[model samples]
Target: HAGNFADVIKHITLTRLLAYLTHKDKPLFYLETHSGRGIYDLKDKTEEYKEGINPVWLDRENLPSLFLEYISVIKQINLNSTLSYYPGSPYFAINQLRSQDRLYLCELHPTEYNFLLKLPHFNKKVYVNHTDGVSKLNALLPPPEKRGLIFIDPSYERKEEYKEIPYAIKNAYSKFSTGLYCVWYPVVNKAWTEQFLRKMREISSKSVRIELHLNPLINEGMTGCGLWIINPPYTFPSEIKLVLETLTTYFNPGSSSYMIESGSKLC
Candidate 1:
């Protein structure tokens, strides 16, 4: 698995959300759809890690508050402070969860699910399932804790997902309006992203849209990625702004840009 700049944004936001949600003394539920391998070995497949975590890992000392929390997790996973392993959302979510909190990871891919199943469980409450998380999202709504974070990160290998994801989000939102939902998508096609966001807007007015473009629009490949969040923490907008602002500096510098749209009028 080659790490890309998109993973940088994804993990940072994930850690921040986990931190925010766990602030209260109450137990929380963390459910991830399309959860890939628990940990990624950056030594193989690609050098894309250079564009993602390498620069930030090198400059870990002068980072902001949010990044400090994120890097702490990276350091815990890597232990040696070397840039060899990259933890995915499940790792980030589990790291922040308390003993009473719960985590559920669903990976549709057999190989990925096996990897997830083999992770050290220790004393934590974790459930790894080899099933379609999107289809299970509705059934797991409004968890017993009455508070949860639902993370949706689809590979978008199928073009139909551009529509199916929004439909699933809308359905899940209807079933559990109070639950916090984070949906990650790639900007491989601007039109597809716009349509997806439009559909998300129809779901809730308290939603937030955070998008990052690593480069200018391209005819091929992903130029950027985004997160469509429903009912995020009140301080999320400002905090994420700082994270993305710092990200642009380490990512593409002057060419990289981000947009945060919330509270209506995604225009």
Candidate 2:
């Protein structure tokens, strides 16, 4: 199911953000609040075969072009290709971290959690916890490093998650005001999605929300994705303008568009 637009949007944005974080001088802490299985084997008979019915990773031509693109972006960050395994936010963070950096990953799903535990990458630098992401996130606020990035990519399987997401970020920000926090949400409908963004603005004075929508027939219905960047880098908007434009051209087509909604204070 990797061929779907969601995977494309998620993997592309994730790899890009990891690349950005790598440029930082100090070792940074990487936290994935809802860490899924670090990697998925598309060739696995049980997993991949089951998901193949929906095949989110494949295009109409049955080619995994998007998956290939994600891999290409990742290889840029990991030039040696020594890291063959795909990783979620936690995995990405651990892989990019220098010796001084740290990582904390939280997952609630038992099966996925068990798989995450088996991943060889988790070492002294990485801490994997099986717990509710929102609760664990609040407990770990103001990470020991005092500087790092927190990625909140929930399943969004529940509608309530949309509302709770901003609240979670708000609570986390109360403790760690300066650290970057990225919240990912799906755009199922304009009405609900707008409400979610509005709620986010209420809690955050300094934030940037970027959306990449890929629905061709709005009336027929579609699913889109967006990112809420709390305390984003000053250069983020300009940087995303170029990247978003290119991505929209290739992935969104006529029905797709991108926007940067800013709030709070800026220099």
Candidate 3:
């Protein structure tokens, strides 16, 4: 359900962060707030993916090394060696995590959770719940592994969520300052997104913003999406620079640009 331009940026960033986490032999914990259908068809009628993932699929071979790992994971889902399918975050996360890691998934939508339950997550300590993903973060913080990633990807169906989600993350960060937090939001209205970013920047000890604008962000519909990463991986800044450059070359669609707001030191 949530595989679009936003999904591409969010998921690719996620895959890289998780890959970096596994670089050490330490255990890890992953908590996903808004997990949609774990699998999807690239040819859906909405064709939302047409301008997002479809072209990436076509240039799979030429993709930067930043994407090889993720693309390989997508290839695994295509048993017949085809590009007709793609895996959502839940599916991709499950494959990336090792046995030593733990996964907590929350899906409030009954229909989406129906598909979520069918994902192949039997390899790890994967737990799926039908509840408010944000509320559950309090008790789950500072995971036993002492290392974790709190992924918040909301639908923004309710206008209030724009205001509420940031506080939720702030509270979680208060308890688990060291944990990584990645938030995905569509760039529909600049003012609203700016207000949300200000609230986010206030609560986060260290944060970075990466946004992509396919067309004029002022136009109707989602011109693009972005990620607000708090306590991101050390190499994330450099890695995203290259990744953004690659996406710009491939998906620019006129007036395409990316903005990366970070500091001189690693956060």
- Which prediction has the highest TM-score against the true structure? 1
Which lDDT tens digits does candidate 3 get at residues 1-267?
A: 344677777889889988988887888899999888788877556766766766777788899899987887778887765567778888889988999989999998899888889888766878988888988888888788899988888988877888989989989988899998999998887888888888988876478889988886459888888998888887788899888878877676556889899743444
Better of 2 and 3 by TM-score: 3
State the TM-score for model 2: 0.80
TM-score of each: 0.95, 0.80, 0.94
Rank order by TM-score, top first?
1, 3, 2
Expressed as tens digits, the lDDT of each residue in 60-164 for candidate 1 is 998987887789878988859678888888887777788888899999999999999977666679999999999998888878998989999999999889899
Model 1 clashing residue pairs (backbone): none
Report RMSD for candidate 1.
1.9
Per-prediction CA RMSD (Å): 1.9, 5.4, 1.8
lDDT accuracy of residue 114 in candidate 3: 86
Task: Name the candidate, 1 or 3, with the larger lDDT value.
Answer: 1
- Residues 1-267, candidate 2: write the lDDT tens digits: 333455555555665666677687877778888888876544444232222212222232443342343455345444363432234555555555566777778889999899888765534477788989787778887877778688888877787887888888888888898888888887776787888888888877788888877666644434677888888775767766665665665664676788877885742
Whole-structure CA lDDT of model 3: 0.83
**2 or 3, greater by lDDT:** 3
